[PDB]
Each structure stands twice: as C-alpha cells, then as structure tokens.
Scaffold this active site. Structure first.
Site, PDB file in Angstrom:
ATOM      1  N   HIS A 166      -4.710 -10.933  -7.009  1.00  0.00           N
ATOM      2  CA  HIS A 166      -5.614  -9.913  -6.528  1.00  0.00           C
ATOM      3  C   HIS A 166      -6.256 -10.093  -5.174  1.00  0.00           C
ATOM      4  O   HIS A 166      -6.822 -11.132  -4.885  1.00  0.00           O
ATOM      5  CB  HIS A 166      -6.711  -9.745  -7.541  1.00  0.00           C
ATOM      6  CG  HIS A 166      -7.615  -8.620  -7.236  1.00  0.00           C
ATOM      7  ND1 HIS A 166      -7.179  -7.315  -7.195  1.00  0.00           N
ATOM      8  CD2 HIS A 166      -8.940  -8.588  -6.981  1.00  0.00           C
ATOM      9  CE1 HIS A 166      -8.198  -6.529  -6.934  1.00  0.00           C
ATOM     10  NE2 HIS A 166      -9.282  -7.277  -6.800  1.00  0.00           N
ATOM     11  N   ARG A 197      -0.217  10.828   1.528  1.00  0.00           N
ATOM     12  CA  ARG A 197      -1.192  11.072   0.463  1.00  0.00           C
ATOM     13  C   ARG A 197      -0.793  10.348  -0.836  1.00  0.00           C
ATOM     14  O   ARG A 197      -0.831  10.960  -1.912  1.00  0.00           O
ATOM     15  CB  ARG A 197      -1.300  12.576   0.150  1.00  0.00           C
ATOM     16  CG  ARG A 197      -1.796  13.532   1.279  1.00  0.00           C
ATOM     17  CD  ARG A 197      -0.986  14.881   1.263  1.00  0.00           C
ATOM     18  NE  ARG A 197       0.388  14.678   1.773  1.00  0.00           N
ATOM     19  CZ  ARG A 197       1.468  15.422   1.494  1.00  0.00           C
ATOM     20  NH1 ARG A 197       1.366  16.473   0.685  1.00  0.00           N
ATOM     21  NH2 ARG A 197       2.663  15.081   2.001  1.00  0.00           N
ATOM     22  N   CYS A 256      -4.015  -3.454  -5.408  1.00  0.00           N
ATOM     23  CA  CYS A 256      -4.665  -4.554  -4.657  1.00  0.00           C
ATOM     24  C   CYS A 256      -4.307  -4.532  -3.189  1.00  0.00           C
ATOM     25  O   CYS A 256      -5.030  -3.980  -2.364  1.00  0.00           O
ATOM     26  CB  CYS A 256      -4.227  -5.940  -5.146  1.00  0.00           C
ATOM     27  SG  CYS A 256      -4.123  -6.091  -6.899  1.00  0.00           S
ATOM     28  N   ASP A 292     -14.177  -4.052  -2.902  1.00  0.00           N
ATOM     29  CA  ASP A 292     -12.864  -4.087  -3.499  1.00  0.00           C
ATOM     30  C   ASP A 292     -12.546  -2.759  -4.118  1.00  0.00           C
ATOM     31  O   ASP A 292     -13.173  -2.328  -5.076  1.00  0.00           O
ATOM     32  CB  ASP A 292     -12.797  -5.185  -4.544  1.00  0.00           C
ATOM     33  CG  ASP A 292     -11.695  -4.966  -5.557  1.00  0.00           C
ATOM     34  OD1 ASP A 292     -10.629  -4.404  -5.200  1.00  0.00           O
ATOM     35  OD2 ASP A 292     -11.905  -5.369  -6.720  1.00  0.00           O
ATOM     36  N   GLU A 296      -2.238   3.333  -7.728  1.00  0.00           N
ATOM     37  CA  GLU A 296      -0.989   3.706  -8.313  1.00  0.00           C
ATOM     38  C   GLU A 296      -0.022   2.552  -8.122  1.00  0.00           C
ATOM     39  O   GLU A 296      -0.179   1.768  -7.179  1.00  0.00           O
ATOM     40  CB  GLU A 296      -0.543   5.007  -7.624  1.00  0.00           C
ATOM     41  CG  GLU A 296       0.957   5.288  -7.503  1.00  0.00           C
ATOM     42  CD  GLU A 296       1.457   5.338  -6.030  1.00  0.00           C
ATOM     43  OE1 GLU A 296       1.071   6.255  -5.250  1.00  0.00           O
ATOM     44  OE2 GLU A 296       2.252   4.453  -5.674  1.00  0.00           O
TER      45      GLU A 296
END
Lengths: 274, 274, 274, 274
Positions: C108, C65, C70, C123, C40
């Site tokens: 990333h 939660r 990345c 990843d 998110e």
C-alpha cells in the site's frame, strides 16, 4: 466494391483498389501486404496484450502503422481478402523449422483461399521466410515466389510446406485443412506470447519485404538488408535511440499513436532485458 | 500381462488386475478410476506447474495419491488402457456448458477407445459431470451411466455430448476425431492454468465418485454429498484446517509426499485469495 | 498558481482552484478526490498493464475518467499536492486488515504531507475504508473524518493506523516514514496485479465517495450504497450490460477513450472468469 | 553447539563445525559457502516457483545440492550464521551495475552481521562478483577479499559498493540499514523471477567459487574458468547433454532429487528458448 475497412487497407498497402477476387488480385495484394505491414513481435516484449478482433487488428496494423505476427498479420489479411470477395478461412499449423523431437502445438496461422476452382494458401505472417505469393495446394510441384522457391507436400493428411535452401528443401511448418475458430487463434497467441520458452519472448524480431526480391531483417540490434535473396549490408545498430530511429525509417513503424505507440524509453527497457 | 506402471495403477484403484481389453474391462476400470483418483485443480491455485509426461503423471496421481483434471486424469487413464492392450488415443474438445457466444478453444481432453469393432469414448477428467462409463459413438441413442444419462449429437463430422436435466438434453462439450499431440495437451493445460479468465484459477475444485451413484463435491468451502444423483447433505466447511482434513478424509488426497504434497499453511494462502 | 496538469485535476474534481497549501486546502482536495476519482482494479482483471508515470496516470485518471488503486490514485494525488505547493512524498505500508500470521509486503502506498509545521498522512487509495481527510501523525488521538473515526498507535519507528469498527478499535494497516522510490511502487504494483494469490485478481472492486458520509461499493455484481456509514440499499446487478451501465452511472467511469476505455464485451469476459 | 540444520550445513560446506561467532568464523564460512553452494537461476527458467521459507531453502540448497540467488543463498546463509550464534538480519539493496537512469527496486538481499562490536556485511548471493569475505561498514577503506578489492562508500543514509573493474571502480549495488521482512524478500523474489524484463528470465546463470581466487562461470553455453581473477580457459559447450554433464561436474549440481531435481530433457527445453 469497397468497404470502410477495405479502404484504409489499400491506403496502407500504398496500392490501388481491387474489386475482383482472382489469382492475380491475390498475387499482388500478398506482395503488397508483405512490403507494407511488417512482421513485429514488439507487443510481446514490452508486456502488452495482443487483441485479435477485427478492430484491434485494424487500429494496430492500419491506423497506428504497426506490425504483428501470425495471428495479427494473417488476421488482417484474411479480412481484406474476404471483403474483396474471396473465399477464405484461416488454418493452424505446426512450426517444425528447428526440426523438433516431437510435433509442437498449433502456433502458426495461415490462410486457405479458394480462387478459380483451385485451392491456394496465402500466408504473410510467418516472418523471415514467409511466402510472398499464394501457392497451389499440390505436392512436389516446386512453386515459385518473388523471394524464394517452396514445395508443398501431401504427407498422409497433413501438408508440409517446405522451401529451397542450400540445394535441398527445408520443412517450415505442417498443417491440415481442419477448420479453426477465433478462440483457437487466441489460444495460439496466448501460447506464443506467454509460454516462458517461446522464442518470441527472448528477442526483438522485425522483418519487412521489398519489391525486388529484397527484405529487411532486425533481430535485436542486428539489422540486415537482402537483395534477390542475398545478404547485402549488415549493420549492427549501436544504441537504443539509433534503433528507435531504424524502426521508423526502414520498417516504417508507427512509433506514435494514442493507443499502440510506444516511447523510445520503453524500447530501451525492452532491449535492456538482453 | 502387467507392466510396472499398470501395477500401482490397479493398486491405487483398489482393484484387481485385468489383462484382456474388453468393453467390460473398460466399463469397470472407468468407474474404478472415477472413484479412486479425484478431480482436483489445486496445483493451479497454489502456483505450481503441471507436467503431463507419463512419470510426472505417475508420481502425482498414483504415488502421491493426488488428483488433477482433463489432461492429468485422462492422461494417466490413457496410459493404463494402453498397457492393458486397448486401442486408445486422446481427443480435444470444446467446453460449451456455459453456452458461450462463440466456440471456445480445445480445453478438454478425452479418450477414444476401439473395443470389439466399435468406437467408444471414455472420459474421467471432466469433473462434476464426467462420464463414469464408456459410451458408444452414436447419435440420439440415450446412453446410460452409473451416474447419469447422456446423448451424443451428430452435427457434421463433429460430435456434441449431452446429459439429462429437467427432461431436456443438455450439451456438455463438442469434439471431433482429429488426432492430437502431447504438445496439444500441454498447450491446453497452459491455457487452463494460466489464461487469466480461466475459471480454474478462481476457485478450488474437487470431485470424487462413489460406488452407488453417489459423488462428493467441493467448491472452495462448499462440500456436498450426492446419492443416486441427489443432494444429500451439504456442509459448509468453516476453516482451512477443517478443510485440510476434509481433503484427506473424503477425497483421499495425499497431502504428504516429498514432491507433490502441500502443507496446510499453503492451502490457507490459496483460500486466502478468495 | 496553476500548472497544465493542476488544471484538468481541478476540472476532474469538479472543484475550484487552490493556490495556497494549507491544512484546509488539503482537507477539501482530499474529499474532492475521494468523490471524483473512483477506486477501481479493472485493468488488473482484464489483463492490461498499469503504468505509474505521471502521464499515464494523467491520461487514465483524468482524461479517460477512470479509476485505479493505491499506486495510481495517491500517485496522481501526490502530483497535485506537489504542484499546489505542498510538501509531499509517498510511503509504503503493509495491509494487515485480514490480520495475517506474518507481516505482508509493502502493498500500500500513501502520502505524507508537511503542512504548517506538522505532519499529516493523506491517502485516497485504500478503497473501501480509505481516509477522506488528512490525519495528524499522533498516537491515541481518536481523529475524525467525514466517513469514519480513526486512531494512531505506536510500536517502533513504524506506524500503525486504525479505525473504530464494530464497537471498538482495530488495525487497518501499518507503515513507516522511510523514503520510497518510483520503482518501489512499480514493484508494489507488480505484486498486487500479478502475484497469483493477490485478491485484486479475483474480483472486480469499485468504490466511490459521496459528500455526506455516503459511499458506493461494487464487488462483482454486489452493488451497495451507504449513508452516514450505513448500508442503505443493496442491489445485486443481474447482468453484464446492466453492470456496464452501473459503472458509468454510479461511479462515473469513462467507458470510452481511445486508450483506456473498454468495450462492454470486455467486461463480460472479465466477469465470466467468476 | 550444533542444531539439526547447522549439521547438514557444515556437511554441505565440506567444512568442520564452528560454535564461536567471530570475525574469523565468518571469514571462512563465507568462503566455504561461496565454493560449495552455487549461484543458479535455473528454477526461474524452467518455470518453477521459488519458496523462501527455511525448509524449502534447506531442501533445495542442502539436500538436493542445488543453487539459488540473492534470496535463497543469503537466506540459507543467514540461518546458519544465526544458529551459530551471530547477530544477523537481511538487507535489501538496489542493483546499479548497469548504471541505470533511475534507481531500480530492492532486488538484492544481503546480510548485516554484528561481530565484535563492529558491523560487517556478508553477501554470498550476488553471483559473478559477490563478496567472498565479510567487509566492514566503512567508507573509502579499500577492503580486500579472496577474489577482489571492493571499496564501499557513502552518500547520505545509503551505501554503495564497488569492485576494481578494468581499473576505475564500477558501482555494483547499494542499500541502507533498514529492516526487511520475509515478505519483502518474497516480493523481491517475485519481481526477479516474474517481471518480464528481469534479466534472470532471459538466460541461464551459474557461478561457483574456487579456493585460490578462482571461479567458474556459466552463461548459457559460455563456460569460463578463472584463476586469481583471470580468464584461464573459455569453453563453449556444444550441446544440452554436454551442458547437463558440465552442471554436475564443474558446479556440482544435484541433478536428481525427488523434489528439486530436473531431467536433462527439461534443461533442453529451457535452452531451447534461446
């Protein structure tokens, strides 16, 4: 009467409930506020957004025992006065202290209160020289306050509150009685916290008021105590840790809190920028 | 009479000088402006500060043949009308199109003009539905414009602007006659260009007006042509290069210029964000 | 063994403790993670700083939660694998999906794990096409994953990773085995969250994984469900409220929490920008 | 040989062309640069994006007679050395002057040059203590420079750098020989110019070098001249106008230029923030 909010408000102000909206009630709540809830701009320096909805204000200024500025302080104060029964609305004015070449935007929030058929202006968020007691909307009348002497001024249609200093008045900020909306403060806060040249982004600022004409003043590491408007003692804090302590001792800053708290390492990164 | 500025103004408007400030002069300059200087928000997307001082405006809107929005467009227009002899000042209003839950800040600039003992409001910077002709400050009176029909409400001291759509008046934005200061626009620009949720930061917007009730409209790659207020032709530009071209062709954007120009590779990084 | 953290980690992963660092342990934790902690970027849109210190990560990804991208996701995952005894360190790579003209910065993060004398790359933070299972550091070898087929090709001491998409191979992103430091991630996050042209500032992105080759995908209001890598059902959420619900239902987002939660009115202002 | 660029480069350096890449050529070009092109962070303070593509660099540093920092200065320098035939590539290192608790990100750019079978590091972008002459990649060897003694060092794959301060050695920055890409510098510039706590956003910084171990130093209004590494004269400029002048006189800043110029009123707004 006493609403849920109004409750912890009085609790934070170390003060006794009040249910009748009168000039005297204002007179005290003002000073109460001025001594309990400090003027702080710390959320601006450690990058951290400033919400202005009564709830964020409640959880920041009351529960977390933290401070704020124009928008936050008078925003909380406005709610209180309202729940107590007064007749209030905020106003936006222009900070003209530095004596700018051209009028600046509406950076400063302040309150307009209608008590006993008269109109007064309460303001606890101006920082260093904020008022510490309501003032009547009238020109020339050198009004008196626990920490200073001020003089409004009907210039055309924009009043120009100014104060006594070194034998003559100084303009502090101008304003008008035009209505403002929450968003108008959100924009005001946006400017102040984000416009690159806003002073609030270039130094830590704290200021708390004391009972007998005294006040505390932090500007980065320069701490200063005042009595009856005089510079009594001026300490230059030597380190972050030491300052972290000073914030909790002298200003009573709620350094912990699930939400609005902040580690001491965070205060370090903030002072590191300077 | 004709000042240095006023000169290249008329030159950019592909129009003939005017020295007498009359409703008719306004009537035409307005439409002139609306067709020559496009509504654009490109400096906001390719990050690049927006100055609002008459000079940056001159060099951006006139010499570099570029566009802008509220603040820039009406800023230039105000200067012109002033140099031509009219009586003008800007006003700030609140954009209520999206029909917001609570009144938004003063995001929009517009002009108030005093011509022949009456008061009119000219506005070339609202974009898509901007006026294309002065309007009289009066309620109910369904006023007419080369590109539409508008009606101004009278809710108190404050006014609301509307225009027809499916046989029902639609409000575009509200506003009052309070004075504004340069800084108030700078703040307005600051909000619009930098407040994260500002729509201007989420899509390219261009809009130019044509003589016979026609207008062009870009929204990222969606180009659209209109005639007498009707969607005639809607092309979906297929690529950056092609769009770079479309900007110069259809809108007459000055893509080159020591200062305000911008490479086509830059436009690519901008549209790449979406 | 099981540390305080490792505890609530497994708890959030609805998974059973593991104390022995083996390829199989990795195999599952990876998929576990991929299904429990969603991808998110909501803290980027509602302006709100992203801390990356194990603690903020703990409180955001586990206790509240919530999701992340990345930096946050692999950051948490890295800690877990470490506390479980594996041999890990992060790596930074360049997102080349869009097939850019020139190599982009190190946006990333990803993990490098040394298990049973070999080197694998885990990843979980890549979003839509993230891996869902460790891969071996080797070229050509078309490696298999619960949600797709990958492959590694060479071009230096630098690494390029791909996945067979429409009918064949094509680059996803690249990186190299160079050491990274926390600050390098902080910078990586700073870029991603604040560089004006970063796509993460222009649309809500959510993605969560399901057991049998399925996954969920939100992009603003466009919700999509997938099974064995196929688009089964695509709903276009009709309103903020309804979306607020979808975030808690489908993705299991902790919408409440003293700290990292967010009202539904907040999500509205965020989607309002688009 | 001499390329179009290389031309105005030499022209700005008030220096005579050089076509043979040798340690001596480096030796002088370095000092040349250090005295011609000042170290300035002014585009960071008056908000104004810093492009790093050779062309913007060309137009800012050469034609407009302006300064820059890490990225811009060494970026220009790198081009020159390249066009002259040397073997160069940039490197990123971490500024450790303040002696930070944990390694900071890759904020500093510097050059690596391969001349006559050896490896040297040239750097004109570090500001106050930048090198003023190439150094050989070797440990302990107390190397000498027209403005100081710098000792390089070891410690794994990374190299530290220091200069005789007081009389003890104070580590400056550090780095490794890893390849960098343009984007890596763009990110570096992004950090430096936008990360709220970056010191570059809190004060004006200018520094220019002189022939005989002398240098100039501006820090807001504190101007300082140095000879053979000694503080000879320290003026505290009294006003913006006066400083505007000092920028053009002492540092030879191209205050005009269609593009990169800046009014004196702009400099005022910048200094007003402090």
């Amino acid at each position: 009467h006493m609403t849920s909010f109004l409750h912890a408000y009085f609790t934070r102000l170390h003060c006794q409930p009040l249910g009748v909206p009168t000039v005297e009630a204002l007179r005290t709540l003002h000073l109460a506020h001025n001594c309990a809830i400090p003027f702080e701009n710390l959320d601006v320096l450690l990058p951290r957004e400033i919400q202005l909805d009564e709830t964020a204000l409640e959880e920041k200024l009351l529960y977390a025992r933290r401070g704020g500025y124009c928008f936050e302080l008078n925003g909380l104060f406005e709610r209180a006065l309202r729940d107590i029964g007064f007749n209030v609305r905020s106003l936006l004015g222009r900070v003209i202290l530095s004596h700018p070449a051209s009028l600046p935007p509406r950076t400063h929030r302040l309150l307009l209160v209608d008590v006993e058929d008269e109109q007064w202006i309460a303001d606890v968020g101006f920082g260093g020289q904020t008022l510490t007691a309501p003032l009547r909307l009238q020109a020339e009348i050198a009004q008196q306050t626990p920490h200073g002497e001020y003089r409004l001024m009907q210039e055309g249609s924009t009043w120009i509150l100014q104060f006594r200093h070194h034998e003559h008045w100084q303009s502090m900020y101008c304003f008008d009685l035009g209505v403002q909306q929450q968003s108008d403060h959100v924009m005001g806060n946006f400017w102040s916290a984000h416009w690159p040249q806003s002073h609030f982004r270039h130094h830590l600022l704290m200021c708390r008021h004391l009972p007998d004409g005294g006040k505390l003043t932090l500007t980065n590491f320069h701490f200063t105590r005042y009595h009856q408007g005089h510079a009594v003692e001026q300490v230059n804090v030597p380190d972050v840790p030491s300052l972290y302590q000073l914030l909790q001792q002298q200003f009573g800053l709620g350094v912990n809190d699930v939400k609005h708290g902040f580690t001491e390492a965070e205060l370090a990164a903030v002072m590191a920028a300077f």
